[PDB]
Design a protein around this ligand. Structure first.
Ligand SMILES: O=C(O)c1ccc(NC(=O)c2cccc(CC3CCCCC3)n2)c(Cc2ccccc2)c1
Ligand SMILES: O=C(O)c1ccc(NC(=O)c2cccc(CC3CCCCC3)n2)c(Cc2ccccc2)c1
Ligand SMILES: O=C(O)c1ccc(NC(=O)c2cccc(CC3CCCCC3)n2)c(Cc2ccccc2)c1
Lengths: 189, 190
Protein backbone atom coordinates (compact mmCIF):
# COMPACT_ATOMS: atom_id res chain seq x y z
CA UNK A 1 0.00 0.00 0.00
CA UNK A 2 0.79 3.68 -0.18
CA UNK A 3 0.45 6.48 2.29
CA UNK A 4 -1.35 9.72 1.48
CA UNK A 5 -1.21 12.94 3.52
CA UNK A 6 -2.13 16.62 3.37
CA UNK A 7 -4.54 19.31 4.57
CA UNK A 8 -8.12 18.75 3.48
CA UNK A 9 -10.81 21.01 2.31
CA UNK A 10 -14.09 20.34 4.06
CA UNK A 11 -16.98 19.93 1.73
CA UNK A 12 -20.69 19.42 2.11
CA UNK A 13 -23.21 18.27 -0.52
CA UNK A 14 -26.36 20.39 -0.63
CA UNK A 15 -29.62 19.48 -2.24
CA UNK A 16 -30.08 22.10 -5.04
CA UNK A 17 -26.56 23.70 -4.92
CA UNK A 18 -23.59 21.75 -6.16
CA UNK A 19 -20.81 22.12 -3.56
CA UNK A 20 -20.42 23.95 -0.33
CA UNK A 21 -16.93 24.52 1.03
CA UNK A 22 -16.79 25.01 4.79
CA UNK A 23 -14.30 26.89 6.89
CA UNK A 24 -12.36 24.13 8.70
CA UNK A 25 -12.86 25.96 12.00
CA UNK A 26 -16.50 25.10 11.50
CA UNK A 27 -15.67 21.44 12.26
CA UNK A 28 -12.65 21.55 14.61
CA UNK A 29 -14.75 20.70 17.69
CA UNK A 30 -14.93 17.24 16.09
CA UNK A 31 -11.18 16.65 15.68
CA UNK A 32 -9.06 14.47 16.23
CA UNK A 33 -10.75 11.76 14.11
CA UNK A 34 -8.98 8.47 14.84
CA UNK A 35 -11.83 6.27 13.58
CA UNK A 36 -11.03 5.15 9.97
CA UNK A 37 -12.94 6.88 7.13
CA UNK A 38 -13.18 5.34 3.69
CA UNK A 39 -10.96 7.01 1.08
CA UNK A 40 -12.75 7.18 -2.30
CA UNK A 41 -12.18 8.77 -5.75
CA UNK A 42 -14.02 11.97 -6.45
CA UNK A 43 -16.95 11.19 -4.12
CA UNK A 44 -17.85 7.98 -5.99
CA UNK A 45 -18.60 5.35 -3.36
CA UNK A 46 -17.84 1.98 -4.93
CA UNK A 47 -14.36 3.47 -5.49
CA UNK A 48 -13.00 2.87 -1.95
CA UNK A 49 -9.17 2.63 -2.30
CA UNK A 50 -8.28 2.69 1.37
CA UNK A 51 -8.77 4.12 4.79
CA UNK A 52 -7.85 7.24 6.76
CA UNK A 53 -5.60 6.75 9.73
CA UNK A 54 -6.10 10.06 11.55
CA UNK A 55 -7.30 13.60 10.92
CA UNK A 56 -5.90 16.18 13.27
CA UNK A 57 -6.26 19.87 13.93
CA UNK A 58 -2.88 21.34 12.85
CA UNK A 59 -1.75 24.94 12.51
CA UNK A 60 -4.23 26.56 10.10
CA UNK A 61 -6.54 23.64 9.26
CA UNK A 62 -7.08 19.90 9.19
CA UNK A 63 -4.29 17.41 8.33
CA UNK A 64 -5.20 13.94 7.06
CA UNK A 65 -3.02 10.77 6.90
CA UNK A 66 -4.34 7.72 5.05
CA UNK A 67 -3.51 4.35 3.64
CA UNK A 68 -4.15 3.34 0.07
CA UNK A 69 -4.56 -0.43 0.12
CA UNK A 70 -6.84 -1.53 -2.74
CA UNK A 71 -4.87 -3.95 -4.90
CA UNK A 72 -7.24 -3.37 -7.86
CA UNK A 73 -6.76 0.41 -7.59
CA UNK A 74 -2.97 0.12 -7.16
CA UNK A 75 -2.66 -2.21 -10.16
CA UNK A 76 -4.86 0.07 -12.30
CA UNK A 77 -3.01 3.27 -11.18
CA UNK A 78 0.38 1.62 -11.92
CA UNK A 79 -0.67 0.45 -15.36
CA UNK A 80 -1.85 3.98 -16.24
CA UNK A 81 1.27 5.58 -14.69
CA UNK A 82 3.52 3.33 -16.77
CA UNK A 83 1.75 2.95 -20.08
CA UNK A 84 -0.89 5.63 -20.64
CA UNK A 85 0.37 8.50 -22.84
CA UNK A 86 -2.57 10.45 -21.51
CA UNK A 87 -1.93 9.93 -17.77
CA UNK A 88 1.75 10.76 -18.49
CA UNK A 89 1.29 13.81 -20.78
CA UNK A 90 0.82 16.58 -18.06
CA UNK A 91 3.97 15.64 -16.12
CA UNK A 92 7.18 17.49 -16.66
CA UNK A 93 9.03 15.52 -15.84
CA UNK A 94 8.70 11.82 -15.10
CA UNK A 95 10.96 9.52 -13.10
CA UNK A 96 10.30 5.77 -13.78
CA UNK A 97 8.78 4.91 -10.91
CA UNK A 98 6.22 7.50 -12.06
CA UNK A 99 3.32 6.37 -9.83
CA UNK A 100 3.75 8.80 -6.90
CA UNK A 101 4.02 11.83 -9.28
CA UNK A 102 1.09 10.57 -11.48
CA UNK A 103 -1.09 10.25 -8.38
CA UNK A 104 -0.03 13.72 -7.16
CA UNK A 105 -0.78 15.18 -10.59
CA UNK A 106 -4.25 13.68 -11.28
CA UNK A 107 -5.50 13.42 -7.68
CA UNK A 108 -3.96 16.64 -6.27
CA UNK A 109 -6.57 17.30 -3.57
CA UNK A 110 -8.17 15.79 -0.49
CA UNK A 111 -11.82 16.55 0.31
CA UNK A 112 -13.28 15.72 3.69
CA UNK A 113 -17.00 15.13 3.31
CA UNK A 114 -19.00 16.56 6.21
CA UNK A 115 -22.70 16.98 7.00
CA UNK A 116 -24.05 20.52 6.38
CA UNK A 117 -23.37 23.22 9.07
CA UNK A 118 -27.10 23.42 9.75
CA UNK A 119 -26.78 20.30 11.96
CA UNK A 120 -27.79 16.41 15.88
CA UNK A 121 -26.66 12.75 15.23
CA UNK A 122 -25.10 10.72 12.34
CA UNK A 123 -21.37 10.96 12.13
CA UNK A 124 -20.12 14.43 11.17
CA UNK A 125 -17.76 12.95 8.62
CA UNK A 126 -18.53 10.41 5.85
CA UNK A 127 -15.36 9.91 3.79
CA UNK A 128 -12.24 11.54 2.39
CA UNK A 129 -11.93 11.67 -1.38
CA UNK A 130 -8.85 11.91 -3.53
CA UNK A 131 -10.07 14.68 -5.77
CA UNK A 132 -9.25 15.91 -9.31
CA UNK A 133 -12.30 18.09 -9.97
CA UNK A 134 -11.79 20.26 -6.86
CA UNK A 135 -10.35 23.70 -6.01
CA UNK A 136 -6.80 24.74 -6.41
CA UNK A 137 -6.63 25.97 -2.83
CA UNK A 138 -6.96 24.55 0.65
CA UNK A 139 -5.48 21.07 0.03
CA UNK A 140 -2.49 19.38 -1.56
CA UNK A 141 -2.34 15.54 -1.60
CA UNK A 142 1.08 13.89 -1.27
CA UNK A 143 1.51 10.14 -1.91
CA UNK A 144 4.45 8.07 -0.68
CA UNK A 145 5.74 4.71 0.57
CA UNK A 146 6.20 5.77 4.20
CA UNK A 147 4.36 8.18 6.36
CA UNK A 148 7.50 9.98 7.53
CA UNK A 149 8.41 10.91 3.96
CA UNK A 150 4.87 12.17 3.29
CA UNK A 151 4.66 14.30 6.43
CA UNK A 152 8.13 15.64 5.45
CA UNK A 153 6.77 17.19 2.21
CA UNK A 154 5.03 19.95 4.36
CA UNK A 155 6.34 23.17 5.71
CA UNK A 156 3.58 24.36 8.06
CA UNK A 157 3.21 21.29 10.31
CA UNK A 158 5.20 22.01 13.55
CA UNK A 159 7.79 19.63 15.07
CA UNK A 160 5.30 18.46 17.76
CA UNK A 161 2.31 18.13 15.36
CA UNK A 162 4.53 16.04 13.13
CA UNK A 163 5.70 13.79 16.02
CA UNK A 164 2.06 13.42 17.19
CA UNK A 165 0.89 12.45 13.71
CA UNK A 166 3.68 9.92 13.07
CA UNK A 167 3.36 8.29 16.52
CA UNK A 168 -0.35 7.70 15.73
CA UNK A 169 0.32 6.37 12.25
CA UNK A 170 3.07 4.03 13.67
CA UNK A 171 0.46 2.29 15.82
CA UNK A 172 -1.76 1.43 12.76
CA UNK A 173 -1.13 -2.08 11.43
CA UNK A 174 -2.11 -1.81 7.76
CA UNK A 175 -3.11 -5.49 7.49
CA UNK A 176 -5.72 -4.91 10.20
CA UNK A 177 -7.65 -2.57 7.84
CA UNK A 178 -10.66 -4.15 6.09
CA UNK A 179 -10.79 -4.71 2.26
CA UNK A 180 -11.87 -1.54 0.43
CA UNK A 181 -14.82 -2.08 -1.99
CA UNK A 182 -13.31 -0.75 -5.19
CA UNK A 183 -14.42 -0.90 -8.80
CA UNK A 184 -12.97 1.25 -11.56
CA UNK A 185 -14.80 4.69 -12.03
CA UNK A 186 -15.78 3.49 -15.56
CA UNK A 187 -17.56 0.42 -14.08
CA UNK A 188 -19.93 2.72 -12.13
CA UNK A 189 -21.80 3.89 -15.31
CA UNK B 1 -22.97 13.35 -36.06
CA UNK B 2 -19.53 11.80 -35.30
CA UNK B 3 -17.55 9.29 -37.31
CA UNK B 4 -14.69 7.26 -35.91
CA UNK B 5 -12.00 5.57 -37.99
CA UNK B 6 -8.85 3.63 -37.36
CA UNK B 7 -6.89 0.45 -37.37
CA UNK B 8 -7.98 -2.01 -34.72
CA UNK B 9 -6.33 -4.51 -32.40
CA UNK B 10 -8.14 -7.80 -32.34
CA UNK B 11 -8.73 -9.37 -28.94
CA UNK B 12 -10.44 -12.50 -27.56
CA UNK B 13 -11.76 -12.49 -23.93
CA UNK B 14 -10.70 -8.82 -23.55
CA UNK B 15 -9.82 -7.65 -20.03
CA UNK B 16 -10.41 -11.15 -18.66
CA UNK B 17 -7.70 -13.67 -17.57
CA UNK B 18 -8.03 -15.69 -20.80
CA UNK B 19 -7.41 -12.51 -22.88
CA UNK B 20 -5.46 -13.05 -26.13
CA UNK B 21 -4.48 -10.56 -28.85
CA UNK B 22 -4.81 -12.23 -32.26
CA UNK B 23 -2.58 -11.52 -35.26
CA UNK B 24 -4.93 -9.93 -37.89
CA UNK B 25 -4.15 -12.75 -40.38
CA UNK B 26 -6.08 -15.05 -38.02
CA UNK B 27 -9.43 -13.36 -38.77
CA UNK B 28 -8.70 -12.21 -42.36
CA UNK B 29 -11.13 -14.80 -43.77
CA UNK B 30 -14.12 -13.41 -41.78
CA UNK B 31 -13.90 -9.89 -43.19
CA UNK B 32 -15.39 -7.61 -44.41
CA UNK B 33 -18.12 -7.14 -41.81
CA UNK B 34 -20.67 -4.57 -42.89
CA UNK B 35 -23.39 -5.59 -40.38
CA UNK B 36 -23.22 -2.99 -37.52
CA UNK B 37 -21.49 -4.13 -34.34
CA UNK B 38 -21.98 -2.11 -31.11
CA UNK B 39 -19.26 0.38 -30.17
CA UNK B 40 -18.70 0.44 -26.40
CA UNK B 41 -16.15 1.86 -24.00
CA UNK B 42 -13.47 -0.40 -22.65
CA UNK B 43 -15.51 -3.61 -23.42
CA UNK B 44 -18.18 -2.56 -20.94
CA UNK B 45 -21.71 -3.58 -22.10
CA UNK B 46 -24.14 -0.80 -21.17
CA UNK B 47 -21.59 1.78 -22.47
CA UNK B 48 -22.73 1.46 -26.16
CA UNK B 49 -22.12 4.86 -27.78
CA UNK B 50 -22.52 3.84 -31.42
CA UNK B 51 -22.31 1.26 -34.21
CA UNK B 52 -19.56 0.15 -36.58
CA UNK B 53 -20.18 0.84 -40.30
CA UNK B 54 -17.54 -1.49 -41.68
CA UNK B 55 -14.52 -3.63 -40.78
CA UNK B 56 -12.24 -4.06 -43.78
CA UNK B 57 -9.00 -5.92 -44.48
CA UNK B 58 -6.70 -3.34 -46.04
CA UNK B 59 -2.98 -3.52 -47.01
CA UNK B 60 -1.67 -2.46 -43.62
CA UNK B 61 -4.26 -4.07 -41.28
CA UNK B 62 -7.96 -4.18 -40.29
CA UNK B 63 -9.66 -0.79 -40.68
CA UNK B 64 -12.78 0.12 -38.75
CA UNK B 65 -15.13 3.00 -39.49
CA UNK B 66 -17.91 3.76 -37.03
CA UNK B 67 -20.66 6.20 -36.08
CA UNK B 68 -20.85 7.58 -32.58
CA UNK B 69 -24.56 8.21 -32.20
CA UNK B 70 -25.51 8.20 -28.57
CA UNK B 71 -27.01 11.63 -27.84
CA UNK B 72 -26.31 11.26 -24.07
CA UNK B 73 -22.68 10.45 -24.78
CA UNK B 74 -22.14 13.10 -27.40
CA UNK B 75 -23.77 15.78 -25.24
CA UNK B 76 -21.82 14.72 -22.18
CA UNK B 77 -18.46 14.50 -24.02
CA UNK B 78 -19.04 17.89 -25.72
CA UNK B 79 -19.91 19.56 -22.37
CA UNK B 80 -16.77 18.09 -20.75
CA UNK B 81 -14.56 19.08 -23.74
CA UNK B 82 -15.80 22.67 -23.15
CA UNK B 83 -15.69 22.80 -19.33
CA UNK B 84 -13.46 20.11 -17.76
CA UNK B 85 -9.85 21.01 -16.88
CA UNK B 86 -9.25 17.30 -16.35
CA UNK B 87 -10.45 16.40 -19.83
CA UNK B 88 -8.30 19.22 -21.24
CA UNK B 89 -5.10 18.67 -19.26
CA UNK B 90 -3.55 16.05 -21.58
CA UNK B 91 -4.47 17.83 -24.84
CA UNK B 92 -2.65 20.65 -26.62
CA UNK B 93 -3.85 24.07 -25.48
CA UNK B 94 -6.77 25.87 -27.17
CA UNK B 95 -7.67 23.34 -29.89
CA UNK B 96 -10.29 24.10 -32.46
CA UNK B 97 -13.04 21.54 -31.99
CA UNK B 98 -12.25 20.39 -28.41
CA UNK B 99 -14.63 17.37 -28.64
CA UNK B 100 -12.68 15.83 -31.50
CA UNK B 101 -9.36 16.40 -29.78
CA UNK B 102 -10.56 15.15 -26.40
CA UNK B 103 -11.87 11.90 -27.96
CA UNK B 104 -8.77 11.46 -30.13
CA UNK B 105 -6.73 11.79 -26.87
CA UNK B 106 -8.70 9.97 -24.20
CA UNK B 107 -10.07 7.09 -26.38
CA UNK B 108 -7.17 6.47 -28.83
CA UNK B 109 -7.63 2.68 -29.09
CA UNK B 110 -10.01 0.63 -31.16
CA UNK B 111 -10.28 -2.95 -29.95
CA UNK B 112 -12.19 -5.54 -32.02
CA UNK B 113 -13.55 -8.36 -29.89
CA UNK B 114 -13.14 -11.81 -31.42
CA UNK B 115 -13.74 -15.46 -30.52
CA UNK B 116 -10.59 -17.47 -29.54
CA UNK B 117 -8.28 -18.90 -32.29
CA UNK B 118 -9.37 -22.30 -30.85
CA UNK B 119 -12.63 -21.92 -32.85
CA UNK B 120 -10.95 -20.35 -35.95
CA UNK B 121 -9.05 -23.29 -37.51
CA UNK B 122 -12.13 -25.45 -37.81
CA UNK B 123 -14.91 -23.22 -39.21
CA UNK B 124 -16.66 -21.24 -36.39
CA UNK B 125 -20.27 -22.01 -35.60
CA UNK B 126 -21.42 -18.47 -34.75
CA UNK B 127 -20.39 -14.77 -35.14
CA UNK B 128 -16.57 -14.38 -35.17
CA UNK B 129 -16.85 -10.77 -33.84
CA UNK B 130 -18.85 -9.27 -30.98
CA UNK B 131 -18.12 -5.49 -30.74
CA UNK B 132 -15.59 -2.73 -31.12
CA UNK B 133 -14.51 -0.80 -28.07
CA UNK B 134 -13.11 2.65 -27.79
CA UNK B 135 -10.18 2.07 -25.42
CA UNK B 136 -8.03 4.25 -23.06
CA UNK B 137 -5.70 1.38 -22.47
CA UNK B 138 -4.03 -1.46 -24.47
CA UNK B 139 -3.51 -0.15 -28.04
CA UNK B 140 -0.71 -2.20 -29.74
CA UNK B 141 -1.20 -2.56 -33.54
CA UNK B 142 -3.57 -0.43 -33.46
CA UNK B 143 -3.24 3.29 -34.52
CA UNK B 144 -4.77 6.39 -32.86
CA UNK B 145 -8.49 6.66 -33.57
CA UNK B 146 -9.56 9.73 -35.53
CA UNK B 147 -12.89 11.39 -34.77
CA UNK B 148 -14.59 13.79 -37.19
CA UNK B 149 -17.90 15.10 -38.57
CA UNK B 150 -17.08 13.90 -42.03
CA UNK B 151 -16.33 10.27 -42.89
CA UNK B 152 -14.13 11.09 -45.94
CA UNK B 153 -12.07 13.50 -43.79
CA UNK B 154 -11.64 10.75 -41.15
CA UNK B 155 -10.44 7.97 -43.48
CA UNK B 156 -8.30 10.35 -45.48
CA UNK B 157 -6.25 11.05 -42.31
CA UNK B 158 -4.58 7.64 -42.73
CA UNK B 159 -2.00 7.78 -45.52
CA UNK B 160 -1.61 4.02 -44.86
CA UNK B 161 -5.06 3.63 -46.53
CA UNK B 162 -4.84 3.96 -50.32
CA UNK B 163 -7.29 5.91 -52.48
CA UNK B 164 -9.03 2.69 -53.63
CA UNK B 165 -9.40 1.27 -50.12
CA UNK B 166 -10.78 4.66 -49.01
CA UNK B 167 -13.42 4.54 -51.82
CA UNK B 168 -14.19 0.86 -50.85
CA UNK B 169 -14.62 1.80 -47.20
CA UNK B 170 -16.64 4.93 -47.92
CA UNK B 171 -18.84 3.05 -50.33
CA UNK B 172 -20.38 1.26 -47.31
CA UNK B 173 -20.23 4.24 -44.94
CA UNK B 174 -22.43 6.62 -46.97
CA UNK B 175 -24.49 3.48 -47.78
CA UNK B 176 -25.74 3.83 -44.20
CA UNK B 177 -28.43 6.24 -43.05
CA UNK B 178 -27.28 7.00 -39.49
CA UNK B 179 -30.81 7.11 -38.03
CA UNK B 180 -32.32 3.68 -38.87
CA UNK B 181 -29.81 2.39 -36.28
CA UNK B 182 -31.10 1.71 -32.79
CA UNK B 183 -30.30 4.11 -29.93
CA UNK B 184 -27.14 2.85 -28.13
CA UNK B 185 -27.67 1.94 -24.49
CA UNK B 186 -25.18 4.55 -22.90
CA UNK B 187 -26.77 6.55 -20.01
CA UNK B 188 -25.06 9.72 -18.68
CA UNK B 189 -23.77 9.57 -15.04
CA UNK B 190 -24.76 13.25 -14.99
O1 LIG C 1 -11.86 0.78 -15.96
C1 LIG C 1 -10.90 0.94 -16.73
O2 LIG C 1 -10.40 0.04 -17.44
C2 LIG C 1 -10.22 2.28 -16.80
C3 LIG C 1 -9.15 2.48 -17.69
C4 LIG C 1 -8.54 3.73 -17.71
C5 LIG C 1 -8.95 4.77 -16.89
N1 LIG C 1 -8.28 5.92 -16.86
C6 LIG C 1 -7.66 6.63 -17.80
O3 LIG C 1 -7.66 6.42 -19.02
C7 LIG C 1 -6.90 7.79 -17.25
C8 LIG C 1 -6.10 8.53 -18.10
C9 LIG C 1 -5.42 9.59 -17.57
C10 LIG C 1 -5.51 9.89 -16.22
C11 LIG C 1 -6.32 9.10 -15.40
C12 LIG C 1 -6.46 9.34 -13.89
C13 LIG C 1 -5.32 8.88 -12.91
C14 LIG C 1 -4.17 8.05 -13.52
C15 LIG C 1 -3.59 6.99 -12.59
C16 LIG C 1 -3.55 7.44 -11.11
C17 LIG C 1 -5.00 7.55 -10.57
C18 LIG C 1 -5.92 8.36 -11.54
N2 LIG C 1 -6.97 8.09 -15.94
C19 LIG C 1 -10.01 4.53 -15.98
C20 LIG C 1 -10.56 5.60 -15.05
C21 LIG C 1 -9.77 5.74 -13.78
C22 LIG C 1 -8.95 4.73 -13.34
C23 LIG C 1 -8.27 4.90 -12.14
C24 LIG C 1 -8.36 6.06 -11.42
C25 LIG C 1 -9.18 7.07 -11.87
C26 LIG C 1 -9.89 6.91 -13.05
C27 LIG C 1 -10.63 3.30 -15.96
O1 LIG D 1 -19.60 10.44 -13.41
C1 LIG D 1 -18.87 9.45 -13.30
O2 LIG D 1 -19.02 8.58 -12.42
C2 LIG D 1 -17.69 9.24 -14.34
C3 LIG D 1 -16.72 8.31 -14.07
C4 LIG D 1 -15.64 8.08 -14.96
C5 LIG D 1 -15.55 8.79 -16.15
N1 LIG D 1 -14.57 8.56 -17.05
C6 LIG D 1 -13.42 7.88 -16.95
O3 LIG D 1 -12.97 7.33 -15.94
C7 LIG D 1 -12.67 7.80 -18.28
C8 LIG D 1 -11.41 7.18 -18.38
C9 LIG D 1 -10.81 7.09 -19.64
C10 LIG D 1 -11.49 7.62 -20.75
C11 LIG D 1 -12.76 8.21 -20.59
C12 LIG D 1 -13.51 8.77 -21.81
C13 LIG D 1 -14.07 10.18 -21.66
C14 LIG D 1 -14.91 10.53 -22.89
C15 LIG D 1 -15.44 11.99 -22.87
C16 LIG D 1 -14.50 13.07 -22.40
C17 LIG D 1 -13.64 12.55 -21.27
C18 LIG D 1 -12.99 11.21 -21.68
N2 LIG D 1 -13.31 8.26 -19.37
C19 LIG D 1 -16.57 9.71 -16.45
C20 LIG D 1 -16.59 10.56 -17.74
C21 LIG D 1 -17.23 9.84 -18.93
C22 LIG D 1 -17.26 8.47 -19.04
C23 LIG D 1 -17.81 7.81 -20.13
C24 LIG D 1 -18.34 8.57 -21.15
C25 LIG D 1 -18.31 9.95 -21.02
C26 LIG D 1 -17.74 10.60 -19.95
C27 LIG D 1 -17.62 9.93 -15.55
O1 LIG E 1 -19.85 17.62 -13.35
C1 LIG E 1 -18.96 18.08 -14.07
O2 LIG E 1 -18.96 19.26 -14.49
C2 LIG E 1 -17.84 17.08 -14.43
C3 LIG E 1 -16.58 17.57 -14.84
C4 LIG E 1 -15.56 16.69 -15.18
C5 LIG E 1 -15.79 15.32 -15.08
N1 LIG E 1 -14.88 14.39 -15.42
C6 LIG E 1 -14.08 14.49 -16.47
O3 LIG E 1 -14.01 15.45 -17.22
C7 LIG E 1 -13.19 13.32 -16.66
C8 LIG E 1 -12.49 13.21 -17.83
C9 LIG E 1 -11.68 12.11 -17.98
C10 LIG E 1 -11.60 11.15 -16.99
C11 LIG E 1 -12.33 11.33 -15.82
C12 LIG E 1 -12.24 10.33 -14.70
C13 LIG E 1 -11.02 10.52 -13.74
C14 LIG E 1 -11.51 10.82 -12.32
C15 LIG E 1 -10.39 11.04 -11.28
C16 LIG E 1 -8.96 11.22 -11.90
C17 LIG E 1 -8.90 11.99 -13.24
C18 LIG E 1 -9.94 11.52 -14.27
N2 LIG E 1 -13.13 12.41 -15.68
C19 LIG E 1 -17.06 14.83 -14.68
C20 LIG E 1 -17.30 13.35 -14.66
C21 LIG E 1 -16.76 12.71 -13.39
C22 LIG E 1 -15.69 11.86 -13.48
C23 LIG E 1 -15.17 11.21 -12.37
C24 LIG E 1 -15.77 11.44 -11.15
C25 LIG E 1 -16.85 12.30 -11.05
C26 LIG E 1 -17.37 12.95 -12.17
C27 LIG E 1 -18.10 15.71 -14.36
Amino acid sequence: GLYVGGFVDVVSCPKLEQELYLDPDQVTDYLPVTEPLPITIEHLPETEVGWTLGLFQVSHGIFCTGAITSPAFLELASRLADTSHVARAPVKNLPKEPLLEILHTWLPGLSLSSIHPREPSGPVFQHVSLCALGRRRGTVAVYGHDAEWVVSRFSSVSKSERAHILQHVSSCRLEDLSTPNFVSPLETL
